[PDB]
Amino acid sequence: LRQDAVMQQVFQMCNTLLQRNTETRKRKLTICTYKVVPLSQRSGVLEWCTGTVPIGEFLVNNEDGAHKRYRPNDFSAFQCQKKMMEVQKKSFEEKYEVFMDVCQNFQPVFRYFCMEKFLDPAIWFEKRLAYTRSVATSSIVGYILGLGDRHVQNILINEQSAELVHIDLGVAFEQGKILPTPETVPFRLTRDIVDGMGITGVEGVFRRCCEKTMEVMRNSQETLLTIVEVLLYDPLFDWTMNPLKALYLAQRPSFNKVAERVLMRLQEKLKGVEEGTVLSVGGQVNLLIQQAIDPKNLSRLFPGWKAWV
């Protein structure tokens, strides 16, 4: 649990940075955090987010899932999961056509979360706006820190405030790309996530908030790089990926050179350098949004990540 506690402070630093900028303080761009109190090298205790439910439990529950309740005629969650695992040991083209076929018979229904919980139009608009701002802020910060393993069970949504909470932050600094099944998406922006943002989708509040968050990240590059440098040289911070962790994450029935490479990769992200070229805040945000919503990248991903969800 020490790794989770370390990630919580970075979220606090990201929260503190966002508060002191007038552009993001007006939009109330913040990151949901929970206290983690490690007790030993093997056991620990952490805060339980009361009033929060996993997004996977709300959407693709077998008994009373959102997809089953609203779209009985569509493919079930079990059916979609079974199909993806079958095409796992197949060609990339076969994977892509399977993913499109599943997505054709699996329409997002996540937009109904705010409708059934906030009948008042004024309250419903506030919660939807807060949800869109929360996703945009978390996605940019998660990309900056290279957060990975953002599957359905690792994301919590507050029932009262409709704000996403990210848990299980063990994978970070783009260690997810080192997995046997690489993470080709900087963050989770699946159809359910976009559908809950309204009819406008990623366009509008989500895109502007992502740009505003990126500007704060770029303006505080010297601060952000220094904080990560302190973390990466912590002897007790086991952020590097090992075969035991890699196999555990995806299961089915010199330290100095790595840290310097991660720091360089973080530095080029904060300056907008992606593929050796300088990209503006708007251009970088557009690239990140496009990569996350690209169906081809989602097809290559692990079925347990539930890209179709």
């Binding site: 790309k177 046997p180 690489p182 075969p243 490479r261």
Partner: protein
Amino acid sequence: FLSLARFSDTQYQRIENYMKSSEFENKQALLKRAKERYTVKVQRELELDELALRALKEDRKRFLCKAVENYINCLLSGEEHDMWVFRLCSLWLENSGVSEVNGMMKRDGMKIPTYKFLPLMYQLAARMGTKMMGGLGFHEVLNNLISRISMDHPH
């Protein structure tokens, strides 16, 4: 033709950069150290990684061939972008082992006017060889191209 050539070269360059990137070496090094129940998962990873490698190599070859073809067409379609012959030669010299690239240079590159190759004549002559003669070989195409250029502009 130039716009398609530039984009195709950019995609090929991105794939080539990824292959030589330190991230690719770190990912490969993890599998090598992992391989040294347990045996079932190891032999799977040595099969998916080569499956990903063959797909990446095929994509690189397709992008490289398309870029070379479009660069030749752009050179034959005008004179404003004659400076891009350096990129066409750079792709050809660095990928002399590809039969498709050598065939396209023989079939279509011979129609390109010789005077466009004069500025980089020093590098073309320095790559002449004999060990790999053949009908589709790079050396024979290079020798025929160099001789044809010397035909038009001996001085």
